[PDB]
Amino acid sequence: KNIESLFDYSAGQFEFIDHLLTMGVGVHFAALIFFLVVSQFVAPKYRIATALSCIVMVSAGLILNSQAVMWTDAYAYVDGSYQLQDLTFSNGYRYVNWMATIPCLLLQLLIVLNLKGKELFSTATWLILAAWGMIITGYVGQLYEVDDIAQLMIWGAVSTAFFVVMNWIVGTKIFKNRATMLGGTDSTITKVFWLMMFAWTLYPIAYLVPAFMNNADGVVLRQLLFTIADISSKVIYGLMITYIAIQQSAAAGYVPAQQALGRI
Numbered sequence: 115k116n117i118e119s120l121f122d123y124s125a126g127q128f129e130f131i132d133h134l135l136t137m138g139v140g141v142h143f144a145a146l147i148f149f150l151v152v153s154q155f156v157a158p159k160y161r162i163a164t165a166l167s168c169i170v171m172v173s174a175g176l177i178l179n180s181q182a183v184m185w186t187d188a189y190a191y192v193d194g195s196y197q198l199q200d201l202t203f204s205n206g207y208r209y210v211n212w213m214a215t216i217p218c219l220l221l222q223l224l225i226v227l228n229l230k231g232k233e234l235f236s237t238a239t240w241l242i243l244a245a246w247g248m249i250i251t252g253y254v255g256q257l258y259e260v261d262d263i264a265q266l267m268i269w270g271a272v273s274t275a276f277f278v279v280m281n282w283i284v285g286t287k288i289f290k291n292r293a294t295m296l297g298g299t300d301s302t303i304t305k306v307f308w309l310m311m312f313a314w315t316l317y318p319i320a321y322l323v324p325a326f327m328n329n330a331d332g333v334v335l336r337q338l339l340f341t342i343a344d345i346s347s348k349v350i351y352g353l354m355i356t357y358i359a360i361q362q363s364a365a366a367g368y369v370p371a372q373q374a375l376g377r378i
């Protein structure tokens with residue numbers, strides 16, 4: 115049902131996608147160790163924001179690892195090209211994993227925005243419901259990326275509505291609570307918003323690849339886009355969230371944070 119299943123791949127195409135996914139794994143698990151060691155310099159009220167980055171690194175790293183082994187399982191070099199065997203490859207499992215990872219990315223934002231108690235719970239709940247609506251309708255949409263492009267588009271339009279509404283909640287909370295943030299991170303959090311807008315928008319672009327580039331090179335393009343998007347939305351984003359957590363910790367008088375920023 116996926117466009118990947120339609121084509122044979124050159125050695126070049128097949129190896130590049132393998133390398134993309136493998137590099138993706140390495141980057142996320144490398145970053146994991148960074149988030150782990152810096153977590154001790156985060157104040158208790160923000161430390162879960164850095165923990166969530168560890169959780170996202172392993173979740174994302176595992177899905178990329180799984181995709182890579184699925185890639186090599188599904189294809190074998192036969193008569194001059196990589197051809198589909200008995201096992202299958204699908205991006206569908208990325209969608210399932212987003213059900214977990216996207217709420218994690220959203221929660222760590224709310225934490226460094228200094229949201230607490232009732233407002234934190236309510237905002238998280240609405241954000242997660244919006245994200246889940248986006249992911250599920252998109253998941254259903256991509257079931258038709260071969261059989262019914264028109265249906266892919268309509269589900270994608272519904273999904274985009276959830277996307278836009280989710281982004282509006284995010285933007286509203288960010289620009290409203292920006293003033294509450296310490297150590298100059300009121301400026302930093304603004305760049306985080308635009309990083310999210312940029313990186314997350316790469317995913318619906320990948321989603322539409324079967325509509326504007328339905329060939330093996332389009333398959334490569336989609337994996338390339340996912341790689342850019344994953345690293346930007348999880349790793350670079352995580353690094354900024356953690357920086358913001360540490361800076362606000364130091365400004366709030368957390369000594370290990372102050373000492374850490376002092377060494378650099």
Ligand SMILES: *C/C=C(C)/C=C/C=C(C)/C=C/C1=C(C)CCCC1(C)C
Binds near residue numbers: 212252
């Ligand atoms: C780490 C993974 C992330 C941040 C995934 C984000 C995914 C999206 C923003 C997905 C968006 C979609 C649309 C807005 C329309 C097409 C269907 C989706 C689900 C791909």
Ligand SMILES: CCCCCCCC/C=C\CCCCCCCC(=O)O
Binds near residue numbers: 334
């Ligand atoms: C934050 C950005 C992260 C960027 C990750 C991507 C790094 C590698 C990118 C690709 C370089 C282009 C490779 C040339 C493609 C060759 C075509 C092919 O063989 O199929």
Ligand SMILES: [Cl-]
Binds near residue numbers: 160
């Ligand atoms: Cl604290």
Ligand SMILES: [Cl-]
Binds near residue numbers: 173215
């Ligand atoms: Cl993920």
